[PDB]
Amino acid sequence: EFNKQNDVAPSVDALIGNTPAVYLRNMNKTAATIVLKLESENPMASVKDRLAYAIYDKAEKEGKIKRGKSVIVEATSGNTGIALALLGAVRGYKVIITMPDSMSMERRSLLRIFGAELILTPASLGMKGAVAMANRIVSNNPDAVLADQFCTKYNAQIHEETTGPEIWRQTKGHVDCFVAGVGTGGTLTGVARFLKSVGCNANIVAVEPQESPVLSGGRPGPHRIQGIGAGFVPEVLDRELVDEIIQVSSDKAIETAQKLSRMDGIFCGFSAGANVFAALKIAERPEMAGKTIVTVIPSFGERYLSTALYASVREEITSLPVVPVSE
Amino acid sequence: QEFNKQNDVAPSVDALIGNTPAVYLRNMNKTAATIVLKLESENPMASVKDRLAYAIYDKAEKEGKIKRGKSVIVEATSGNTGIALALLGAVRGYKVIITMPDSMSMERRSLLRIFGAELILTPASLGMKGAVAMANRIVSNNPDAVLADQFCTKYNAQIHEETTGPEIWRQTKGHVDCFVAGVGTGGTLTGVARFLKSVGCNANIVAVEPQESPVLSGGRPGPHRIQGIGAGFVPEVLDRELVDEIIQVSSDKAIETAQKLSRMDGIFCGFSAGANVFAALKIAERPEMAGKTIVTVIPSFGERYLSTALYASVREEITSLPVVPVSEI
Ligand SMILES: *Cc1c(COP(=O)(O)O)cnc(C)c1O
Ligand SMILES: *Cc1c(COP(=O)(O)O)cnc(C)c1O
Ligand SMILES: [Cl-]
């Protein structure tokens, strides 16, 4: 009996989740239906808003942190720190985020606009170095807690309680396959568990980068698909629930993102491109005719505008004429 | 089963426009008034203008004034109206041409091209008067071109009287003592106002303009930093007879307010939201507004304004920053 279109929210943390879903319209010329769950429509434009919500809300409820006193600490060069910052501002906690020096001014402003404290580590050390400084500050201060996004039990829990039930209602009980990229793995896992709760046997599909195919027989590498494919198996990912793995090149991911905008009005990030690519691969399978596939759009595209994802679109806008003496 | 975003699957992105959330302003409000913020920032391309694009396309199609694949939508705009018109072009299968001056950033031109809009750069020297003239030129050359016409169109206020107004009425359960909003085209103000008079609500209707360009108060058009409002003239769309009062807000008071909205309430938004909230808070201090409900609009999400004046001060802090030394393991 909280409805965002019908009611006034008490505060912005109440606007987390209950995200829309949209049929994939033009790009789908298969006989499968594809539902896109738009996590991009969360308040700070990331699925990670659900995770920050869970950490703060569940830690508070298990007496494990308190307003004014607690200090939330994380090493994150992505959206999790934005979301932690956001909920810090709303709920009255000091937040410290640790990240490599290579991060853009846009991604550091996003933290500091919410009052978070930054502490930067040298680029060559990367994320192992940030992880390092995070643990250092956490055990030095009696008031610090590490969020612990990759190992926390709050991660899959929140998706089993929110994202799952929502998709189930939104599709009215028709989900024949659920496809999602694995970052922390909480989205895939949390949703899968919900579907097993209600006796739905939808095929569960993980999506990984080709340039880092860790959930298969493959070694960690670099890839440009921000938010998924972290170079290991997360503790949070329940592997037994996963029926199938689909690898996507960065290139097939960027193509797909760019078409999503041009063809369907769905402005999103790299991970979204991968997920939809995977969805559409699955939809072309002959046994999937008349079935429903659900995937996730995890982030809105605006954060990724000055990145490889829209490099080709930035080619075409320079290479354009001014005009001079016409009126 | 009218459309509910939380419980339904939209047929396409245009069906997700409108039905935006509302949130009470909590920490920044040191008054005895309640302040409701209508979050137009939560539209699909993150501004209020998505409602206007929807209206133009949807009403023009229904009056036979345009046809898919045939008709070409044209507008001169260096702001969010262009993004919305682009978006709906992509979704509904129309060609869009946007004219703007050459001074526009690669970020703001990407946002258009990503939807396959056509761009036409006019010279920065001539600014917007120059873009406006090109747009009219293209429209008179091409029998299938249509000017979106954001400042003059009947569609603009209509959509706010049919959607924005009714939504606010349901969300506030009929408690609206004042509606305050910045005037770009004037359609949000006017459309909501008309709706409130339709249901017999006599809320005080408040326009907000930039202090440095106080045209609705008889000052002269001037420069200001408050993207979205203060066009430098009175739009035909604006019904001034419905407006009870005008409040001016400095660019600087608009920036401070937007920065606090983030820091203090988690509401990440642009300059015009800053202005609106500031104005709402000025009204809320009035003694006669004690225990009354003031509604305003957050028109756009903040991420588009990250490399602008709005967050310049915050970008100071993050560039002059320590790394830490040889001191990890
Ligand atoms: C976190 C993240 C995901 C993956 O979701 P998990 O909860 O980690 O499975 C996908 N892409 C982006 C953009 C992310 O921010
Ligand atoms: C256009 C717009 C407004 C003004 O709304 P109107 O309905 O056009 O008066 C305010 N701020 C921003 C950012 C907008 O894009
Ligand atoms: Cl006053």
XYZ file of C-alpha atoms and ligand atoms in Angstrom:
687
model
C 0.000 0.000 0.000
C 2.962 2.271 -0.766
C 2.575 3.241 -4.443
C 5.071 5.832 -5.818
C 2.608 7.165 -8.408
C -0.258 7.389 -5.907
C 1.467 8.567 -2.731
C 4.099 10.973 -1.389
C 7.255 9.255 -0.234
C 8.682 10.175 3.184
C 12.172 10.518 1.747
C 14.311 9.460 -1.199
C 15.285 6.067 0.269
C 11.574 5.096 -0.026
C 11.847 5.558 -3.820
C 14.449 2.766 -4.148
C 13.158 -0.263 -6.069
C 9.619 -0.588 -7.386
C 11.231 0.139 -10.735
C 9.351 -0.087 -14.082
C 9.616 -2.813 -16.679
C 9.267 -2.417 -20.443
C 8.790 -4.880 -23.276
C 11.735 -4.825 -25.758
C 9.884 -3.691 -28.828
C 11.738 -2.908 -32.054
C 15.036 -4.779 -31.433
C 13.192 -8.073 -30.796
C 12.045 -9.660 -34.072
C 11.918 -13.161 -32.466
C 8.722 -14.962 -31.348
C 9.899 -14.744 -27.698
C 8.795 -11.890 -25.453
C 11.538 -9.922 -23.713
C 10.866 -7.977 -20.540
C 13.402 -5.435 -19.398
C 13.560 -4.674 -15.686
C 14.724 -1.039 -15.448
C 17.063 -0.782 -12.479
C 18.361 2.316 -14.282
C 15.237 4.063 -12.888
C 16.415 3.846 -9.253
C 17.064 7.277 -7.635
C 20.840 7.376 -8.405
C 20.358 5.476 -11.593
C 21.936 2.139 -10.566
C 20.748 -1.287 -9.257
C 23.305 -0.690 -6.454
C 20.823 1.618 -4.770
C 19.022 -1.567 -3.604
C 22.222 -2.836 -2.037
C 23.047 0.437 -0.175
C 19.486 0.459 1.074
C 19.858 -3.103 2.378
C 23.196 -2.535 4.131
C 22.068 0.611 5.956
C 18.605 -0.665 6.736
C 19.464 -4.157 7.872
C 22.605 -3.129 9.772
C 20.524 -0.452 11.641
C 17.788 -3.052 12.405
C 20.393 -5.562 13.755
C 21.795 -2.818 16.106
C 25.137 -3.293 14.168
C 25.355 0.581 13.376
C 23.789 3.843 14.783
C 23.248 7.375 13.344
C 25.833 10.070 14.248
C 28.165 7.350 15.645
C 28.831 4.978 12.748
C 31.215 5.511 9.817
C 30.567 3.600 6.610
C 33.625 2.619 4.605
C 34.068 1.040 1.191
C 36.533 0.703 -1.659
C 34.609 1.138 -4.862
C 35.335 2.859 -8.144
C 31.706 2.182 -9.280
C 28.063 2.753 -8.457
C 28.052 1.117 -4.986
C 29.890 4.055 -3.527
C 27.486 6.548 -5.097
C 24.588 4.630 -3.520
C 26.358 4.366 -0.111
C 27.081 8.112 -0.275
C 23.472 8.853 -1.181
C 22.027 6.894 1.771
C 24.636 8.389 4.111
C 23.274 11.887 3.252
C 19.646 10.858 3.686
C 20.122 8.841 6.916
C 22.883 10.912 8.673
C 26.085 8.841 8.453
C 29.713 9.910 7.640
C 30.857 7.894 4.633
C 34.437 7.178 3.484
C 35.136 5.846 0.008
C 38.584 4.660 -1.116
C 39.393 4.311 -4.812
C 42.373 4.406 -7.305
C 43.629 7.847 -8.449
C 42.587 7.126 -12.095
C 38.863 7.807 -11.416
C 37.306 10.731 -13.383
C 36.293 14.140 -11.856
C 32.626 13.226 -12.677
C 32.729 10.050 -10.532
C 34.435 11.856 -7.616
C 32.008 14.809 -7.683
C 29.144 12.237 -7.483
C 30.459 11.194 -4.051
C 31.381 14.592 -2.741
C 27.993 16.118 -3.764
C 26.520 13.842 -0.987
C 29.042 14.809 1.690
C 31.183 11.614 1.422
C 34.900 11.762 2.248
C 37.291 10.501 -0.439
C 40.746 9.063 0.090
C 42.589 8.214 -3.151
C 45.137 5.349 -3.723
C 47.846 5.221 -6.497
C 46.692 3.908 -9.851
C 49.284 1.108 -10.275
C 48.019 -0.625 -7.096
C 44.422 -0.421 -8.456
C 41.622 -2.110 -6.545
C 43.795 -4.474 -4.364
C 45.324 -1.187 -3.066
C 41.952 0.470 -2.422
C 40.715 -2.784 -0.744
C 43.896 -2.454 1.406
C 43.236 1.141 2.548
C 39.587 0.320 3.292
C 40.489 -2.498 5.729
C 43.171 -0.226 7.261
C 40.715 2.559 8.068
C 38.026 0.023 9.166
C 40.107 -1.663 11.878
C 41.874 1.612 12.985
C 38.546 3.269 13.910
C 36.274 1.724 16.610
C 33.254 3.305 14.790
C 34.033 2.178 11.192
C 32.230 -0.604 9.344
C 33.162 -1.983 5.983
C 30.053 -2.322 3.860
C 31.603 -5.520 2.363
C 29.506 -5.518 -0.898
C 31.017 -8.749 -2.414
C 30.664 -10.963 0.708
C 27.500 -9.481 2.483
C 24.360 -11.568 3.088
C 22.241 -8.417 2.685
C 22.931 -8.432 -1.094
C 20.985 -11.424 -2.429
C 18.445 -10.980 0.419
C 17.225 -7.619 -0.890
C 16.701 -8.970 -4.408
C 14.792 -11.971 -3.110
C 12.521 -9.598 -1.167
C 12.143 -6.783 -3.763
C 13.453 -7.308 -7.312
C 12.107 -10.894 -7.487
C 8.562 -10.249 -6.252
C 8.348 -7.140 -8.414
C 9.332 -8.963 -11.623
C 6.944 -11.747 -10.689
C 4.028 -9.290 -10.301
C 5.027 -7.204 -13.319
C 5.068 -10.279 -15.592
C 1.956 -11.662 -13.804
C 3.698 -14.979 -13.101
C 5.134 -15.537 -16.661
C 8.929 -15.903 -16.513
C 10.348 -18.769 -18.624
C 13.939 -17.496 -18.393
C 15.796 -14.924 -16.281
C 19.088 -13.507 -17.608
C 21.524 -11.319 -15.736
C 25.143 -10.297 -15.641
C 27.143 -11.160 -12.590
C 28.874 -8.352 -10.699
C 28.479 -9.172 -7.001
C 25.933 -11.769 -8.217
C 23.172 -10.575 -5.871
C 20.648 -9.698 -8.601
C 20.898 -13.081 -10.326
C 20.989 -15.038 -7.065
C 18.303 -13.084 -5.135
C 15.871 -13.312 -8.048
C 16.561 -16.995 -8.722
C 15.884 -17.823 -5.100
C 12.604 -15.974 -5.205
C 11.564 -17.853 -8.363
C 12.394 -21.227 -6.647
C 10.336 -20.007 -3.605
C 7.171 -19.948 -5.774
C 7.977 -23.078 -7.718
C 8.954 -21.300 -10.935
C 11.544 -23.328 -12.952
C 12.705 -20.544 -15.287
C 16.157 -21.189 -16.805
C 18.675 -19.058 -14.852
C 21.423 -17.482 -17.030
C 24.611 -15.704 -15.945
C 26.307 -13.297 -18.323
C 30.027 -12.695 -18.240
C 32.566 -10.760 -20.291
C 34.469 -12.751 -22.887
C 37.670 -10.880 -21.897
C 37.298 -12.296 -18.270
C 35.323 -15.620 -18.407
C 35.807 -16.649 -14.784
C 32.505 -18.512 -14.158
C 33.677 -20.949 -16.923
C 37.109 -22.498 -17.736
C 38.887 -19.138 -18.144
C 41.349 -16.748 -16.471
C 40.712 -13.138 -15.257
C 41.653 -10.357 -17.719
C 40.856 -6.709 -18.604
C 37.441 -5.921 -20.243
C 35.572 -2.591 -20.736
C 32.079 -3.844 -19.476
C 31.679 -1.782 -16.280
C 29.762 -3.255 -13.340
C 29.971 -7.035 -14.104
C 32.859 -9.523 -14.354
C 34.982 -8.575 -11.298
C 37.857 -11.132 -11.864
C 36.692 -13.911 -9.426
C 33.667 -15.876 -8.122
C 31.865 -13.655 -5.508
C 31.035 -15.360 -2.114
C 27.417 -13.972 -2.615
C 26.829 -15.876 -5.896
C 25.061 -19.213 -5.258
C 26.458 -21.185 -8.208
C 24.030 -24.129 -7.855
C 21.053 -21.920 -8.971
C 22.710 -21.056 -12.301
C 21.582 -23.201 -15.228
C 23.866 -21.712 -17.946
C 26.574 -19.132 -18.744
C 26.701 -16.848 -21.772
C 29.823 -14.844 -22.631
C 29.575 -11.535 -24.477
C 32.423 -9.602 -26.187
C 32.720 -5.910 -25.203
C 31.993 -5.224 -28.855
C 28.703 -7.159 -29.057
C 27.811 -5.332 -25.724
C 28.455 -1.800 -27.043
C 26.639 -2.472 -30.330
C 23.631 -3.663 -28.299
C 23.589 -0.662 -25.909
C 23.734 1.768 -28.814
C 20.853 0.067 -30.617
C 18.817 0.065 -27.389
C 18.877 3.872 -27.467
C 18.552 4.443 -31.202
C 15.836 1.806 -31.728
C 13.962 1.506 -28.376
C 14.673 4.732 -26.397
C 16.428 2.692 -23.678
C 19.510 4.631 -22.625
C 21.806 2.351 -20.625
C 25.339 1.130 -19.748
C 27.715 -1.629 -20.903
C 26.243 -4.368 -18.676
C 22.737 -3.712 -20.039
C 24.078 -4.083 -23.598
C 25.517 -7.474 -22.634
C 22.362 -8.643 -20.880
C 20.128 -7.746 -23.791
C 22.520 -9.327 -26.265
C 22.326 -12.529 -24.230
C 18.513 -12.238 -23.987
C 18.165 -11.884 -27.741
C 20.574 -14.856 -28.317
C 18.309 -16.967 -26.087
C 15.135 -15.623 -27.801
C 16.333 -16.887 -31.272
C 16.418 -20.476 -29.956
C 13.435 -22.359 -31.510
C 12.120 -23.825 -28.181
C 11.706 -20.229 -26.808
C 8.841 -19.345 -29.184
C 5.946 -17.816 -27.274
C 8.021 -17.803 -24.011
C 8.969 -14.844 -21.750
C 12.557 -13.827 -21.066
C 13.358 -11.290 -18.367
C 16.565 -9.375 -18.076
C 17.953 -6.370 -16.266
C 18.950 -2.920 -17.395
C 21.280 -2.147 -14.416
C 22.317 1.473 -15.043
C 21.242 4.594 -16.978
C 23.438 5.626 -19.883
C 24.304 9.220 -18.830
C 27.221 8.137 -16.575
C 28.884 6.399 -19.573
C 28.676 9.292 -22.100
C 32.451 10.048 -22.210
C 33.540 6.403 -22.380
C 34.209 3.735 -25.030
C 30.493 2.869 -24.950
C 29.524 6.029 -26.889
C 32.979 6.755 -28.473
C 31.572 5.976 -31.983
C 28.650 8.380 -31.415
C 31.156 11.094 -30.311
C 33.018 10.432 -33.681
C 29.955 11.437 -35.657
C 29.149 14.749 -33.732
C 32.554 16.307 -34.465
C 32.900 15.865 -38.271
C 29.865 18.129 -38.382
C 29.581 21.526 -40.086
C 28.922 24.790 -38.392
C 27.026 27.172 -40.797
C 28.130 30.848 -41.282
C 26.245 33.701 -43.002
C 22.537 32.579 -43.178
C 19.542 33.828 -41.476
C -5.978 -1.743 -14.505
C -5.100 1.729 -15.673
C -1.283 1.820 -16.051
C 0.740 1.286 -12.849
C 4.528 1.475 -13.305
C 5.329 -0.643 -10.194
C 2.965 -3.481 -11.239
C 2.786 -3.469 -15.054
C 5.045 -3.937 -18.041
C 5.022 -0.842 -20.199
C 4.597 -1.490 -23.969
C 7.375 0.985 -24.707
C 9.387 3.756 -23.106
C 6.926 6.527 -23.949
C 4.319 4.828 -21.689
C 6.764 5.361 -18.763
C 6.647 9.162 -19.122
C 4.705 10.876 -16.347
C 3.346 9.152 -13.259
C 6.434 10.479 -11.514
C 7.010 10.191 -7.743
C 6.623 12.927 -5.122
C 8.658 13.225 -1.890
C 8.366 15.513 1.184
C 11.328 17.844 1.705
C 12.603 16.822 5.149
C 15.921 18.228 6.423
C 16.095 21.530 4.474
C 12.628 22.571 5.690
C 12.980 24.598 8.955
C 9.367 25.870 8.670
C 5.870 25.051 9.888
C 4.770 24.329 6.254
C 4.848 20.980 4.528
C 6.722 20.962 1.172
C 5.951 18.405 -1.513
C 8.429 17.947 -4.336
C 7.076 16.549 -7.629
C 10.020 14.686 -9.153
C 9.906 15.328 -12.908
C 13.617 14.409 -12.678
C 12.361 10.803 -12.604
C 10.987 10.857 -16.187
C 12.757 8.432 -18.628
C 15.283 11.026 -19.938
C 15.375 12.764 -16.617
C 13.499 16.021 -17.156
C 9.986 17.396 -17.249
C 10.300 17.992 -21.002
C 9.614 14.330 -21.622
C 5.945 15.181 -20.917
C 5.984 17.981 -23.504
C 7.604 15.758 -26.239
C 5.038 13.083 -25.483
C 2.223 15.637 -25.865
C 3.470 17.109 -29.174
C 3.975 13.751 -30.838
C 0.827 12.178 -29.414
C -1.617 14.995 -29.931
C -0.230 16.021 -33.333
C -0.550 12.404 -34.577
C -4.153 12.301 -33.332
C -5.099 15.591 -35.043
C -3.512 14.252 -38.303
C -0.941 17.114 -38.228
C 1.920 14.476 -38.451
C 2.522 10.889 -39.699
C 5.218 8.306 -38.792
C 8.224 7.971 -41.173
C 6.851 10.903 -43.200
C 6.977 13.858 -40.809
C 10.133 15.616 -39.535
C 10.085 17.304 -36.141
C 12.196 20.413 -35.853
C 13.190 22.544 -32.912
C 15.889 24.943 -31.960
C 16.884 24.092 -28.395
C 20.152 23.855 -26.503
C 18.389 22.092 -23.564
C 16.220 19.205 -22.506
C 13.390 19.747 -25.007
C 15.816 18.485 -27.633
C 16.650 15.300 -25.721
C 12.919 14.588 -25.197
C 12.026 15.244 -28.852
C 14.990 13.036 -29.837
C 13.837 10.300 -27.479
C 10.289 10.186 -28.759
C 11.486 10.298 -32.353
C 13.463 7.053 -31.732
C 10.559 5.384 -29.971
C 7.759 6.407 -32.339
C 9.660 6.403 -35.688
C 10.159 10.053 -36.593
C 13.054 12.030 -37.927
C 14.106 14.796 -35.625
C 16.196 17.825 -36.468
C 17.590 19.935 -33.659
C 19.290 23.275 -34.308
C 21.566 24.688 -31.659
C 24.671 26.957 -31.586
C 28.200 25.530 -32.071
C 29.043 26.266 -28.367
C 27.141 23.177 -27.109
C 29.271 20.438 -25.449
C 30.014 16.930 -26.913
C 28.054 15.527 -23.920
C 24.860 17.422 -24.887
C 25.232 16.567 -28.597
C 25.831 12.861 -27.866
C 22.521 12.756 -25.926
C 20.759 13.676 -29.193
C 22.786 11.582 -31.593
C 22.354 8.461 -29.436
C 18.649 8.597 -30.488
C 19.571 9.217 -34.132
C 18.469 12.860 -34.069
C 20.016 15.099 -36.703
C 21.940 18.080 -35.459
C 22.572 21.422 -37.179
C 25.236 23.605 -35.588
C 24.683 27.348 -36.046
C 27.461 29.881 -35.116
C 27.923 30.594 -31.429
C 28.157 34.394 -32.193
C 24.465 34.388 -33.219
C 23.436 32.186 -30.233
C 19.847 31.038 -30.004
C 18.337 33.743 -32.348
C 20.527 32.039 -35.034
C 19.393 28.467 -34.261
C 15.787 29.756 -34.211
C 16.161 31.270 -37.692
C 17.650 28.036 -39.138
C 14.781 26.007 -37.680
C 12.173 28.256 -39.333
C 14.151 28.055 -42.612
C 14.184 24.248 -42.645
C 10.501 24.154 -41.751
C 9.505 26.454 -44.647
C 11.662 24.527 -47.159
C 10.310 21.079 -46.240
C 6.539 20.505 -46.604
C 6.739 17.582 -44.138
C 8.753 19.477 -41.453
C 6.885 20.585 -38.342
C 8.067 23.044 -35.728
C 7.667 21.556 -32.223
C 7.039 25.174 -31.147
C 7.633 24.685 -27.339
C 6.835 28.342 -26.348
C 3.605 28.649 -28.429
C 2.017 25.186 -28.654
C -1.407 24.420 -27.129
C -0.113 20.943 -26.362
C 2.224 22.161 -23.622
C -0.114 23.382 -20.905
C -2.706 20.755 -22.031
C -0.470 17.815 -21.037
C 0.194 19.313 -17.552
C -3.509 19.902 -17.022
C -4.187 16.280 -17.960
C -1.252 14.512 -16.231
C 0.971 16.588 -13.939
C -1.997 18.319 -12.250
C -4.089 15.206 -11.603
C -1.083 13.279 -10.364
C -0.192 15.912 -7.787
C -3.850 15.997 -6.653
C -3.865 12.210 -6.013
C -0.413 12.187 -4.362
C -1.248 15.089 -1.993
C -4.811 13.677 -1.513
C -6.373 17.064 -2.375
C -4.084 19.193 -0.078
C -2.501 21.878 -2.163
C -2.351 25.333 -0.610
C 0.288 26.679 -2.944
C 1.828 25.583 -6.216
C 5.200 27.157 -7.063
C 7.185 26.625 -10.246
C 9.761 28.182 -12.466
C 8.660 29.379 -15.853
C 10.605 28.103 -18.890
C 7.825 27.771 -21.481
C 5.299 28.304 -18.657
C 3.454 25.089 -19.401
C 3.982 23.249 -16.077
C 2.779 26.325 -14.183
C -0.189 27.036 -16.434
C -1.380 23.467 -16.978
C -1.291 22.630 -13.246
C -2.968 25.951 -12.362
C -5.787 25.236 -14.751
C -6.277 21.821 -13.311
C -6.411 23.237 -9.769
C -9.142 25.735 -10.804
C -10.987 22.871 -12.510
C -11.385 21.032 -9.156
C -12.146 24.154 -7.229
C -8.757 24.432 -5.525
C -7.654 28.049 -4.971
C -4.010 27.421 -4.159
C -1.757 30.493 -4.533
C -0.013 30.108 -7.967
C 3.616 31.203 -7.919
C 5.948 31.842 -10.825
C 9.693 31.775 -10.328
C 12.128 33.671 -12.568
C 15.868 34.442 -12.384
C 16.702 37.586 -10.477
C 19.169 38.772 -13.150
C 16.476 38.350 -15.896
C 13.224 39.382 -14.216
C 11.102 39.783 -17.315
C 7.711 38.801 -15.768
C 8.349 41.653 -13.233
C 9.193 44.362 -15.817
C 12.987 44.109 -15.634
C 15.054 43.520 -18.741
C 16.240 40.237 -20.274
C 19.685 39.486 -18.934
C 22.150 36.558 -18.672
C 21.816 34.025 -15.770
C 23.102 30.493 -14.980
C 19.599 28.905 -14.273
C 19.133 26.363 -17.037
C 15.512 25.634 -17.759
C 13.805 28.919 -16.860
C 14.101 32.603 -17.778
C 13.855 32.528 -21.613
C 14.186 36.353 -21.823
C 10.568 37.046 -22.876
C 6.991 36.129 -21.898
C 5.942 32.806 -23.582
C 2.545 32.708 -25.353
C 2.009 29.410 -23.410
C 1.990 31.213 -20.048
C -1.491 32.285 -18.883
C -0.506 35.280 -16.731
C -4.149 35.762 -15.528
C -3.755 32.526 -13.413
C -0.470 33.655 -11.748
C -0.922 35.149 -8.240
C 2.693 36.112 -7.634
C 6.266 36.105 -8.971
C 9.351 35.323 -6.889
C 12.879 36.087 -8.203
C 15.849 33.836 -7.269
C 19.509 34.761 -7.838
C 21.608 32.218 -9.743
C 23.738 31.931 -6.629
C 20.787 31.259 -4.287
C 19.686 28.616 -6.898
C 23.094 26.894 -6.880
C 23.345 26.872 -3.095
C 19.894 25.349 -2.785
C 20.588 22.593 -5.370
C 23.834 21.699 -3.605
C 22.093 21.440 -0.219
C 19.161 19.392 -1.687
C 21.816 16.743 -2.537
C 23.908 16.990 0.629
C 21.002 17.247 3.089
C 18.028 15.446 1.405
C 19.568 13.112 -1.236
C 17.733 14.972 -4.056
C 20.207 15.275 -6.955
C 18.976 17.939 -9.336
C 19.650 20.979 -11.530
C 19.626 24.742 -11.220
C 15.875 25.272 -11.718
C 15.021 22.755 -8.933
C 17.338 24.795 -6.665
C 15.369 27.935 -7.612
C 11.979 26.353 -7.106
C 12.835 24.921 -3.700
C 14.374 28.146 -2.551
C 11.185 29.961 -3.562
C 8.987 27.344 -1.856
C 11.008 27.745 1.366
C 10.577 31.570 1.185
C 6.780 31.117 0.940
C 6.860 28.469 3.715
C 8.322 31.004 6.189
C 5.248 33.171 5.815
C 3.168 33.001 9.025
C -0.087 32.394 7.092
C 1.528 29.284 5.551
C 1.764 27.530 8.901
C 0.482 23.978 8.607
C -0.224 24.493 4.871
C 0.992 22.332 1.946
C 3.271 23.832 -0.712
C 3.972 21.894 -3.881
C 6.819 22.505 -6.250
C 8.676 20.709 -9.045
C 12.142 19.216 -9.321
C 12.374 19.540 -13.196
C 15.645 17.724 -13.943
C 18.133 15.196 -12.504
C 21.547 16.521 -11.520
C 23.900 14.293 -13.540
C 23.518 16.398 -16.697
C 24.803 19.487 -14.802
C 27.927 17.812 -13.274
C 30.494 19.717 -15.389
C 28.730 23.108 -15.058
C 28.702 26.068 -12.636
C 26.178 24.233 -10.465
C 28.788 21.797 -9.120
C 31.952 23.857 -9.914
C 32.625 24.412 -6.167
C 32.487 20.651 -5.534
C 34.900 20.015 -8.460
C 37.361 22.455 -6.665
C 37.575 20.092 -3.712
C 38.177 16.843 -5.669
C 41.029 18.025 -8.002
C 43.254 19.478 -5.219
C 43.489 16.126 -3.438
C 46.134 13.920 -1.781
C 46.984 10.455 -2.918
C 48.481 8.380 0.014
C 52.196 7.467 -0.236
C 53.924 4.034 -0.148
C 51.601 3.017 2.648
C 49.158 0.111 1.788
C 49.783 -3.747 1.855
C 26.343 -4.106 -9.738
C 26.203 -3.930 -11.193
C 25.636 -4.997 -11.967
C 25.492 -6.446 -11.517
O 24.514 -6.727 -10.450
P 24.882 -7.565 -9.035
O 23.951 -7.185 -7.712
O 26.334 -7.309 -8.688
O 24.717 -8.945 -9.682
C 25.510 -4.769 -13.308
N 25.963 -3.632 -13.893
C 26.167 -2.521 -13.175
C 26.104 -1.200 -13.875
C 26.346 -2.610 -11.771
O 26.423 -1.302 -11.156
C 11.849 23.562 -19.377
C 12.221 23.240 -18.005
C 11.659 24.001 -16.929
C 10.451 24.910 -17.093
O 9.192 24.188 -17.337
P 8.087 24.726 -18.336
O 6.956 23.769 -18.254
O 8.726 24.630 -19.682
O 7.831 26.169 -17.840
C 12.395 24.099 -15.771
N 13.656 23.596 -15.668
C 14.145 22.732 -16.593
C 15.490 22.067 -16.385
C 13.407 22.470 -17.784
O 14.144 21.713 -18.719
Cl 8.275 37.143 1.567
